[PDB]
Each structure stands twice: as structure tokens, then as C-alpha cells.
UniProtKB/Swiss-Prot annotation:
The lineage of its organism: Eukaryota, Metazoa, Chordata, Craniata, Vertebrata. K-252a binds at E103, H104, M105, S153. Ras proteins such as HRAS mediate the activation of RAF proteins such as RAF1 or BRAF which in turn activate extracellular signal-regulated kinases (ERK) through MAPK (mitogen-activated protein kinases) and ERK kinases MAP2K1/MEK1 and MAP2K2/MEK2. MAP2K1/MEK1 binds KSR1 or KSR2 releasing the inhibitory intramolecular interaction between KSR1 or KSR2 protein kinase and N-terminal domains. This allows KSR1 or KSR2 dimerization with BRAF leading to BRAF activation and phosphorylation of MAP2K1. This is Dual specificity mitogen-activated protein kinase kinase 1. It is found in: Cytoplasm, Cytoskeleton, Microtubule organizing center, Centrosome; Cytoplasm, Cytoskeleton, Microtubule organizing center, Spindle pole body; Cytoplasm; Nucleus. U0126 binds at K56, D167, F168, G169, V170. It is linked to Cardiofaciocutaneous syndrome 3: A form of cardiofaciocutaneous syndrome, a multiple congenital anomaly disorder characterized by a distinctive facial appearance, heart defects and intellectual disability. Heart defects include pulmonic stenosis, atrial septal defects and hypertrophic cardiomyopathy. Some affected individuals present with ectodermal abnormalities such as sparse, friable hair, hyperkeratotic skin lesions and a generalized ichthyosis-like condition. Typical facial features are similar to Noonan syndrome. Melorheostosis, isolated: A sclerosing bone disorder characterized by hyperostosis of the cortex of tubular bones, frequently involving one limb. The lesions may be accompanied by abnormalities of adjacent soft tissue, joint contractures, sclerodermatous skin lesions, muscle atrophy, or hemangioma. Keywords: Acetylation, ATP-binding, Cardiomyopathy, Cytoplasm, Cytoskeleton, Disease variant, Ectodermal dysplasia, Intellectual disability, Kinase, Membrane, Nucleotide-binding, Nucleus, Phosphoprotein, Serine/threonine-protein kinase, Transferase, Tyrosine-protein kinase. It comes from Homo sapiens. Its EC number is 2.7.12.2. It is a peripheral membrane protein. ATP binds at residues 33-41, 56, 102-105, 109-112, 151-154, 167.
Length: 292
């Protein structure tokens, strides 16, 4: 950690304390940040602190004993404190819906950023990759947590140039209803799986952000393709050989021959990217623009 990262984390944990138990009454809606797989996210104001938060509403049908164990397992999120993880405020049940309250990220997700930028430059994706790896490393080492839901909508960014992971499961399992999938071939097979599965998800997400589009290229037809056909790749000529090799190594279908976190962190793409002074914050703020 840099001193500034060390300090930014300090700064967050103090006003987190300036927050008591959370209740539906204490929240005031500002705007809607989006929705997804059965979750609605709202930009909220928490009046007792006056703090801006993001509040996710999860309609989990049926309580009672099952809902109170969910909230108690969610309490580990208080201990997840990293410059590569989104800050947690608290969680409760209300009106048949679990609410997870977290740090508000003003740049939104890289899914939203991509939709704006068209495609995200390779040098920026180096900064994103370093952050994702470090966040996945942190979750593994400090909490023995695997993410299980790496994708562009779960990598959040802000006007301070921070890149953070969110929506990592903490309740066990509890682990295709949509049109796209970031699940590895081995996860689709029902096979046992590990953090190698998150590496595939990261690799796929990177190719989506580099080219501007989900790269595979009906839901069950798509899943069959992931399982049975060659992995996606970057186009040649427009991306560095080492970036191509980096995603290729993330996208090897055998999770055991696929690169691991340790290997990727010393990979030539990561080595090069880490030494590059790239103004990511300026890129992001110039790309999204300012509220006017
Ligand atoms: C059901 C759940 C509350 C179990 N507890 C769980 O363990 C979680 S945790 C968690 N998200 C989460 C994780 C970390 C941070 I920082 C912020 C977060 F919002 C989530 C979460 O949102 N899951 C969504 C439910 C809708 C469909 N997609 C998966 C969960 C799931
Ligand atoms: N802390 C946050 N700050 C800003 N935006 C957020 C935050 N959390 C979630 N969002 C946005 O809310 C939208 C919907 O989030 P979500 O319900 O997590 O959908 P999803 O990420 O596509 N699916 P999943 O993460 O699997 O539940 C996304 O576009 C996010 O960018
Ligand atoms: Mg999400």
C-alpha cells in the first residue's frame, strides 16, 4: 500500500464509525444507479450521518432463520478493508428485501464506463488488471474468500481514480437466467472450482472492455460454446503481444493450466503496466465528464 492508499482507508473507517445501526426510515433516495440479476441499487442519503451511500436491495423470498444468518455472515464485510475492495456500511432486512449499504462510487461500474467510452484503452486495462488481481489476492489471503462474480458491472471506479471490486459472496452457496455469462468452463460443468474461475472471468471481462463488446462470439447455446469451443482472444495488430499473452493465459480452459494470481502479478503485461505512469483518474473523469 502507498501512504495515500493507507490514508484514504484511514479516512473511510472513521466516518464509518459515525454511523449507527441502519433502518429504512433513516434513508432518503437521491437517484437510481441501475439494476441487475435481482438487485436494485439506489444512490441514497443516510440522514443521521448525512453520508452518501449506495444501497442495494435484494428481494430474497422467505425469511426467518435463513434471513438472519445471511445478515450475520454479511458482517464479515466490516473486516474487508482494502483500496481494491468497495467499502461496506451495513446490512439489514426490510419489506421482504435485504439491503446492502456500501460506499458510493461516482464513476459507477466499468460496464457503464465502457458503454460511454466505446472501448477502454490497453494501458488503462493494465491499471484495471493490477487492481482486480490485488483485490482477488486480498480476498483470498485475508478472508479466504473467492469472488465468484467478476465482471465489468462488479468493478467500480471513482473520481479519485480508485478501482474496486464489489458483489463478492460471503454466505456460502447460495452459489443462466440472463443473456450473457462470465462463468468459467469448469464452473459451467459443475466441476469443483476455485479462484481460477475468477481469473477466467477477469480475462473475459478484459477482452470485453478492450474490444467494446461481449466477445463470445440463446443462453444455452452460448454456455455450450464456452464449454466446448476455443476461448475468445484479442485481435492481432492493435494490442501488445504481452496483453494478448496475458488474457490468453487467463482464458486457458483447463483451470489447472490457466495462470494463477501469483503468476499473473509477475507477468510481463503487469510488470510493464505497473511501471507506467498512466493518469487513470484523468482518463476516467475526462471520459465520463463532470456534472454540469
Ligand atoms: C443473497 C446474498 C445477499 C447473500 N449474501 C451475500 O453474501 C451477498 S454479498 C452481496 N453483494 C455485495 C458484496 C460485497 C459488497 I462491498 C457489496 C455487495 F453488495 C450479495 C449480492 O448482492 N448478491 C446478488 C443478489 C442479486 C443477484 N446477484 C447476486 C450477496 C447475496
Ligand atoms: N457502490 C456503488 N456505487 C455506484 N454504483 C453501483 C454501486 N453498486 C452497484 N452499482 C451499480 O448498480 C448497477 C446494478 O448493480 P447490480 O444489481 O450489482 O447489477 P450487476 O452487477 O449487473 N449483477 P450482480 O452484481 O451479479 O448482482 C450497476 O450498473 C452498478 O454500476
Ligand atoms: Mg453487481
Amino acid at each position: 500500500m502507498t501512504l495515500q492508499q493507507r490514508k484514504r482507508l484511514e479516512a473511510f473507517l472513521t466516518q464509518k464509525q459515525k454511523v449507527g445501526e441502519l433502518k429504512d426510515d433513516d434513508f432518503e433516495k437521491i437517484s437510481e444507479l441501475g439494476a441487475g440479476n435481482g438487485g436494485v441499487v439506489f444512490k441514497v442519503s443516510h440522514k443521521p450521518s448525512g453520508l452518501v451511500m449506495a444501497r442495494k436491495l435484494i428481494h430474497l423470498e422467505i425469511k426467518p432463520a435463513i434471513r438472519n444468518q445471511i445478515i450475520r455472515e454479511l458482517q464479515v464485510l466490516h473486516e474487508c478493508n482494502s483500496p481494491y475492495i468497495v467499502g461496506f456500511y451495513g446490512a439489514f432486512y426490510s419489506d421482504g428485501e435485504i439491503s446492502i449499504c456500501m460506499e458510493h462510487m461516482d464513476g459507477g461500474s466499468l460496464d457503464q464506463v465502457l458503454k460511454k467510452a466505446g472501448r477502454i484503452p490497453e494501458q488503462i486495462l493494465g491499471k484495471v488488471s493490477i487492481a482486480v488481481i490485488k483485490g482477488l489476492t486480498y480476498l483470498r489471503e485475508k478472508h479466504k474468500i473467492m469472488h465468484r462474480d467478476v465482471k465489468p458491472s462488479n468493478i467500480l471506479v471513482n473520481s479519485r481514480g480508485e478501482i474496486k471490486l464489489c458483489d463478492f459472496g460471503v454466505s456460502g452457496q447460495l452459489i443462466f437466467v440472463g443473456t450473457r455469462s462470465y462463468m468459467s468452463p469448469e464452473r459451467l460443468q459443475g466441476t469443483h472450482y476455485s479462484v481460477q474461475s475468477d481469473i477466467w472471468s477477469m480475462g473475459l471481462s478484459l477482452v470485453e472492455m478492450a474490444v467494446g463488446r461481449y466477445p463470445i462470439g440463446a443462453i444455452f447455446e452460448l454456455l455450450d460454446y464456452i464449454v466446448n469451443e476455443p476461448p475468445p482472444k484479442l485481435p492481432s495488430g492493435v494490442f501488445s503481444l504481452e496483453f494478448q499473452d496475458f488474457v490468453n493465459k487467463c482464458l486457458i480452459k483447463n483451470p489447472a493450466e490457466r495462470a494463477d494470481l501469483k503468476q499473473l502479478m509477475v507477468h510481463a503485461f503487469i510488470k510493464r503496466s505497473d511501471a507506467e505512469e498512466v493518469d487513470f483518474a484523468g482518463w476516467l473523469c475526462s471520459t465520463i465528464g463532470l456534472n454540469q
